[PDB]
């Protein structure tokens, strides 16, 4: 299971979704209610640290797994307007994420495309939650096809 | 009813495909319109703001907010279309110096808003954090008498809206320096703050 | 042919624009131009009113000016109305527009083709009026012309004519 | 990350089976964890910090802070505190406060709507003796009022007026509803003859199981 | 010679081109600010966009007649042909066509296949019954047509952005009996 989020510049979320494998019909045992918002706000610190630097620990829009913490692989992405696309990776065992950078990158690229399609609405201003079910339908089909 | 400010939903991956409702191509088709129609909408903008405002200053800030609401849109659209959709593409530089986002403006923004590239772009010798962006002929506002400058703030309202949302907060004012054969030349100067500069003071 | 004094009147009132430019002299302009513009407004209606028992109107392009504004022969919106006035010292060329707005060029040249070059020139100054006054947001409707830019847009046109 | 490890300290101190007395390191810890988020953005995390801060200040047994952070959790009233489930614990952390020092002026002045002060005579033989304003005579006035929280047991007691004339009331010890606008019944002014001069009134005094508080003025205007 | 031919000729002389996306962005910022400052009361902003469009069209007609010289439209089907073939073809790059006349030929519907005034726009849900988005043309289609003394009234029926199938505007004229004496 994976918790996905898009966070504003003033530390607020515009999108949040949690999606799991169907074998575990309930997902993230006891971490979902308490741990997963807090470790994401913790990772916002180090994504804010690496946004301004030149040579990382190329092209600065994607970046790798940013930390590893209670066996959870936390993967980020930084848009052009400053939005941050932090999405974590859970499993009962340890998880490999770097092998999915052939696929994950493409996933962050077209959800960036979806966010640009959201932003081009003149009615939708920033610091608003993305309250659209069509956006949910596209991001869960992209979650299915980029598993 | 998907994302409120109240909770997060949990739904399984690899389930059924849901309905298809709305979609559109992000890449631009090449569309053209007359200069007269956009000039008419521009003077109607300035006429309504002349009608519903008292003095010059808050009129200028309202016009700059009008430009801001194009610029914060326009940043991601131009960078995403300069990176290249469903077609396989990567991610540009996402530039983070001061001296190359102004290069990005003078190269791509003015050649996107207008047919022609922006003319000159120089620094200030007398002081740092002051940058000159200059054209020779403003095609937004060529239809007003030249002694008023406040109607020229809309386009620099774009530029502040291009800059503050990109991570470099700043402030812009515009003046008219009648140099050479061009009677209207329209310098826009960009005043940054100290808190960005020492940031790139920290980065060697 | 040669144009020496320009006058733009209202569609329903006293005039908006007047210039006695390129006459290197001082003539009176204060408050008699409003009276004469109102009498032109009256006698256009009087000159249209009488009908001789009759019971065309096409211009030609001479490439006047200086990419011109139009490259084809065109049409006219005053079939039965005053078109010029001819005296000893001047000929006055008038051209009205379909909305009711008229344009007056007092020409000090003395004594057919003059109507063609006059209608072409006054259609070009109608084009510059539309492109440089009606676009202005500060210009309210049916007020005197205050644009400084319209001045050197028409001075250069007249000094390009001769 | 300092926010996360102070949360870890506070939740590890929460789950102990022992008991611990008051100590001002807890005081400076509570002020730096409240001031650490910019509280006085994300709101779910602010709820999840002060929902632990109220439990720690209960476990320390200092009721001034559970009263204070309950009257800071009143800012997040109209969303993200669900339909009397978390408002049940928001009650059971505020009932021992309201039976103790928490005597603040019921969390908001946005309770009273625009009341109407008509009177209903029954005789056509008497009508408006004289030589907007109301021209009162007898009958009685009427008020209506609401609260907006998901909790129950908002209890008005002894609703009466200001430093105006001998307009009085009788008794008001009954309830008012949770979400709706319950119209409170007849207050029955027993008015006294005075001088002709007009002067409007802002509001009237209502206690919520306390002493009678200040104004709680009318919404959107003074509504004279 | 024919209007449907020479409109393209005016489309390649003395029409300085500008990108339509900028026009959409400034119109979207106008209607977004108008939505915001009127406290989400969506019936007033159609009236305010009409009051802007009247002052657009009453100055636009004197530029349209200046750029292309035409005689007066002797019947209103010629008015429909010039609005279909040169008025929206010179200024915008769109060719709408006319359908759905009244039987006495007083009313005409201007079906409009795609609108280049609203590309990226998705309306909010509370505004989905009481805001016609591209209202501004209706003021133009009063104003310009009120200055050639075709005293008409202009109103929408349906649009694609409100979930209906098509965008069309139905205009009918009331009286004329007025014009320049010449």
Curated annotation (Swiss-Prot), chain B:
A cellular component term, taken from the record's GO annotations: phagophore assembly site
Compartments reported by the entry: Golgi apparatus, cis-Golgi network; Endoplasmic reticulum; Preautophagosomal structure
Listed transmembrane segments: none
Gene3D superfamilies the UniProt entry points to: Trafficking protein particle complex subunit 3
Pfam families assigned: TRAPP (PF04051)
Domain of life: Eukaryota
Gene Ontology biological-process annotations: endoplasmic reticulum to Golgi vesicle-mediated transport; intra-Golgi vesicle-mediated transport; macroautophagy; retrograde transport, endosome to Golgi
Keywords (A to Z) from UniProt: Autophagy, Endoplasmic reticulum, ER-Golgi transport, Golgi apparatus, Transport
Keyword Transport: yes
Cited SUPFAM superfamilies: Ligand-binding domain in the NO signalling and Golgi transport (SSF111126)
PANTHER family tied to this protein: 41-2 PROTEIN ANTIGEN-RELATED, TRAFFICKING PROTEIN PARTICLE COMPLEX SUBUNIT 5
Subunit structure and binding partners: Part of the multisubunit TRAPP (transport protein particle) I complex composed of BET3, BET5, TRS20, TRS23, TRS31 and TRS33. Part of the multisubunit TRAPP (transport protein particle) II complex composed of BET3, BET5, TRS20, TRS23, TRS31, TRS33, TRS65, TRS85, TRS120 and TRS130. Part of the multisubunit TRAPP (transport protein particle) III complex composed of BET3, BET5, TRS20, TRS23, TRS31, TRS33 and TRS85.
Additional note from the record: Present with 8350 molecules/cell in log phase SD medium.
Family membership: Belongs to the TRAPP small subunits family. BET3 subfamily.
Protein's name according to its UniProt entry: Trafficking protein particle complex subunit 31
Protein's gene: TRS31
Swiss-Prot record, chain C:
A GO cellular component entry from the record: cytosol
GO biological process, one term: intra-Golgi vesicle-mediated transport
Endoplasmic reticulum is among the record's keywords: yes
Compartments, record wording: Golgi apparatus, cis-Golgi network; Endoplasmic reticulum; Preautophagosomal structure
Keyword Membrane: no
SUPFAM superfamilies assigned: SNARE-like (SSF64356)
Source species, domain of life: Eukaryota
Annotated CDD domains: TRAPPC4_synbindin
Keyword terms: Autophagy, Endoplasmic reticulum, ER-Golgi transport, Golgi apparatus, Transport
Annotated InterPro entries: Longin-like_dom_sf, TRAPPC
Family listed: Belongs to the TRAPP small subunits family. TRAPPC4 subfamily.
Subunit structure: Part of the multisubunit TRAPP (transport protein particle) I complex composed of BET3, BET5, TRS20, TRS23, TRS31 and TRS33. Part of the multisubunit TRAPP (transport protein particle) II complex composed of BET3, BET5, TRS20, TRS23, TRS31, TRS33, TRS65, TRS85, TRS120 and TRS130. Part of the multisubunit TRAPP (transport protein particle) III complex composed of BET3, BET5, TRS20, TRS23, TRS31, TRS33 and TRS85.
The protein's role, per its UniProt record: Component of the TRAPP I, TRAPP II and TRAPP III complexes which act as guanine nucleotide exchange factors (GEF) for YPT1. TRAPP I plays a key role in the late stages of endoplasmic reticulum to Golgi traffic. TRAPP II plays a role in intra-Golgi transport. TRAPP III plays a role in autophagosome formation.
Misc remark: Present with 3130 molecules/cell in log phase SD medium.
Record PANTHER family: TRAFFICKING PROTEIN PARTICLE COMPLEX SUBUNIT, TRAFFICKING PROTEIN PARTICLE COMPLEX SUBUNIT 4
From Swiss-Prot, chain D:
UniProt miscellaneous comment: Present with 259 molecules/cell in log phase SD medium.
Assembly mode: Part of the multisubunit TRAPP (transport protein particle) II complex composed of BET3, BET5, TRS20, TRS23, TRS31, TRS33, TRS65, TRS120 and TRS130. Interacts directly with TRS65.
Family indicated by similarity: Belongs to the TRS120 family.
Protein role: Specific subunit of the TRAPP II complex, a highly conserved vesicle tethering complex that functions in the late Golgi as a guanine nucleotide exchanger (GEF) for the Golgi YPT1 GTPase. TRS120 plays a role in the YPT GEF activity of TRAPP II in concert with the two other TRAPP II-specific subunits TRS65 and TRS130.
Subcellular location: Golgi apparatus, cis-Golgi network
Record protein name field: Trafficking protein particle complex II-specific subunit 120
Stretches that traverse the bilayer: none
Curated annotation (Swiss-Prot), chain E:
Pfam families on file: TRAPP (PF04051)
Keywords: Autophagy, Endoplasmic reticulum, ER-Golgi transport, Golgi apparatus, Lipoprotein, Palmitate, Transport
Residues linked to a lipid group, S-palmitoyl cysteine type: 73
Record-level GO BP terms: cellular response to nitrogen starvation; cytoplasm to vacuole targeting by the Cvt pathway; endoplasmic reticulum to Golgi vesicle-mediated transport; intra-Golgi vesicle-mediated transport; macroautophagy; retrograde transport, endosome to Golgi
Predominant localisation class: Golgi
Subcellular location: Golgi apparatus, cis-Golgi network; Endoplasmic reticulum; Preautophagosomal structure
Gene Ontology CC: one annotated term: endoplasmic reticulum
Extra remark beyond the main annotation: Present with 2370 molecules/cell in log phase SD medium.
UniProt subunit comment: Part of the multisubunit TRAPP (transport protein particle) I complex composed of BET3, BET5, TRS20, TRS23, TRS31 and TRS33. Part of the multisubunit TRAPP (transport protein particle) II complex composed of BET3, BET5, TRS20, TRS23, TRS31, TRS33, TRS65, TRS85, TRS120 and TRS130. Part of the multisubunit TRAPP (transport protein particle) III complex composed of BET3, BET5, TRS20, TRS23, TRS31, TRS33 and TRS85.
Protein name as it appears in the record: Trafficking protein particle complex subunit BET3
Organism field: Saccharomyces cerevisiae (strain ATCC 204508 / S288c)
């Amino acid at each position: 299971p994976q918790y996905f989020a898009i966070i504003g510049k003033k530390d607020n979320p515009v999108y949040e979704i949690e999606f799991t494998n169907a074998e575990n019909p309930q997902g993230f045992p006891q971490d979902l209610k308490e741990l997963n918002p807090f470790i994401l706000h913790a990772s916002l610190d180090i994504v804010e640290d690496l946004q301004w630097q030149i040579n990382p620990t190329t092209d600065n829009c994607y970046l790798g797994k940013v930390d590893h913490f209670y066996g959870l692989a936390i993967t980020a992405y930084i848009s052009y307007s400053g939005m941050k696309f932090v999405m974590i990776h859970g499993n009962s065992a340890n998880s490999s994420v770097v092998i999915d950078d052939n696929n994950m990158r493409s996933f962050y690229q077209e959800v960036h495309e979806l966010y640009v399609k959201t932003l081009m609405n003149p009615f939708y201003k920033i610091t608003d939650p993305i309250r659209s079910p069509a956006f949910d339908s596209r991001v869960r089909t992209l979650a299915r096809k980029h598993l | 009813t998907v994302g409120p400010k109240q909770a997060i939903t949990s739904e399984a991956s690899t389930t059924y495909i849901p309905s298809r409702i709305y979609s559109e191509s992000l890449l631009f088709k090449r569309q053209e319109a007359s200069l007269s129609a956009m000039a008419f909408l521009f003077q109607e903008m300035i006429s309504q703001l002349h009608r519903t405002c008292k003095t010059a200053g808050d009129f200028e800030t309202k016009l700059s907010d009008y430009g801001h609401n194009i610029g914060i849109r326009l940043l991601e659209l131009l960078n995403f279309r300069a990176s290249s959709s469903n077609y396989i593409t990567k991610m540009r530089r996402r530039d983070l110096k001061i001296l190359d986002i102004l290069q990005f403006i003078h190269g791509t923004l003015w050649s996107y808003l207008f047919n022609h590239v922006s003319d000159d772009l120089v620094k200030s010798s007398e002081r740092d954090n002051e940058y000159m962006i200059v054209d020779n002929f403003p095609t937004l506002t060529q239809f007003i008498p030249g002694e008023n400058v406040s109607c020229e703030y809309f386009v620099c309202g774009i530029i502040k809206g291009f800059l503050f949302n990109a991570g470099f907060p700043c402030g812009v004012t515009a003046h008219r320096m009648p140099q050479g054969g061009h009677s209207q030349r329209t310098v826009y100067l960009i005043q940054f703050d100290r808190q960005v500069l020492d940031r790139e003071g920290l980065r060697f | 042919m040669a144009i020496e004094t320009i006058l733009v009147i209202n569609k329903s009132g006293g005039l908006i624009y007047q210039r006695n430019f390129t006459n290197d002299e001082q003539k009176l302009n204060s408050n008699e131009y409003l009276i004469l513009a109102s009498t032109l407004h009256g006698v256009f209606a009087i000159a249209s009113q009488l009908t001789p028992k009759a019971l065309n109107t096409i211009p030609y392009i001479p490439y006047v000016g200086m990419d011109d504004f139009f490259k084809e022969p065109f049409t006219n919106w005053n079939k039965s109305g005053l078109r010029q006035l001819c005296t000893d010292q001047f000929t006055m060329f008038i051209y009205q527009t379909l909305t009711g707005l008229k344009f007056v060029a007092i020409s000090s040249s003395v004594m057919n083709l003059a109507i063609q070059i006059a209608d072409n020139f006054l259609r070009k100054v109608y084009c510059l009026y539309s492109d440089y006054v009606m676009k202005d947001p500060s210009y309210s409707m049916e007020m005197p012309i205050r644009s400084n830019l319209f001045d050197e847009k028409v001075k250069k046109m007249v000094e390009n004519l001769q | 990350k300092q926010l996360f490890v102070l949360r870890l300290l506070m939740v590890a101190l929460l789950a102990t089976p022992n008991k611990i007395a008051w100590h001002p390191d807890y005081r400076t810890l509570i002020d730096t964890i409240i001031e650490l988020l910019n509280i006085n953005t994300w709101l779910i995390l602010q709820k999840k910090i002060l929902q632990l801060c109220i439990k720690v200040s209960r476990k320390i047994n200092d009721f001034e802070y559970v009263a204070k952070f309950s009257s800071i959790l009143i800012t997040k009233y109209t969303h993200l505190l669900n339909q009397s489930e978390q408002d049940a614990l928001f009650k059971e952390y505020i009932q021992p406060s309201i039976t103790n020092e928490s005597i603040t002026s019921y969390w908001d002045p946005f309770i009273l709507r625009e009341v109407v002060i008509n009177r209903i005579l029954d005789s056509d033989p008497t009508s408006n003796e004289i030589p907007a304003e109301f021209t009162c005579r007898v009958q009685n006035p009427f008020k209506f009022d609401f609260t907006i929280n998901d909790i129950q047991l908002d209890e008005e007691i002894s609703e009466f007026c200001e430093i105006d004339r001998k307009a009085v009331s009788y008794s008001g010890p009954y309830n008012v509803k949770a979400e709706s606008i319950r119209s409170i019944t007849l207050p029955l002014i027993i008015k006294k003859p005075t001088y002709k001069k007009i002067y409007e009134i802002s509001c009237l005094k209502i206690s919520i199981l306390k002493l009678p508080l200040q104004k709680f003025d009318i919404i959107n205007d003074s509504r004279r | 010679r024919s209007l449907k031919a020479m409109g393209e000729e005016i489309w390649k002389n003395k029409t300085e081109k500008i990108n339509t996306e900028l026009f959409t962005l400034t119109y979207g910022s106008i209607v977004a600010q108008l939505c915001q400052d009127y406290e989400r009361d969506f019936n007033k902003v159609n009236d305010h966009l009409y009051s802007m469009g009247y002052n657009i069209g009453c100055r636009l007609i004197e530029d349209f007649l200046a750029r292309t010289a035409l005689p007066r439209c002797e019947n209103l089907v010629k008015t429909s042909e010039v609005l279909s073939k040169c008025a929206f073809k010179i200024f915008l790059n769109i060719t709408p066509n006319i359908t759905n006349w009244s039987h006495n030929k007083d009313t005409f519907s201007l079906i409009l296949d795609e609108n280049p005034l609203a590309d990226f726009v998705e309306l909010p849900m509370d505004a989905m019954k009481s805001l016609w988005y591209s209202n501004i043309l209706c003021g133009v289609l009063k104003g310009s047509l009120e200055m050639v003394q075709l005293d008409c009234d202009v109103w929408f029926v349906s649009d694609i952005l409100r979930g209906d199938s098509q965008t069309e505007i139905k205009v009918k004229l009331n009286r004329i009996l007025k014009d320049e004496i010449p």
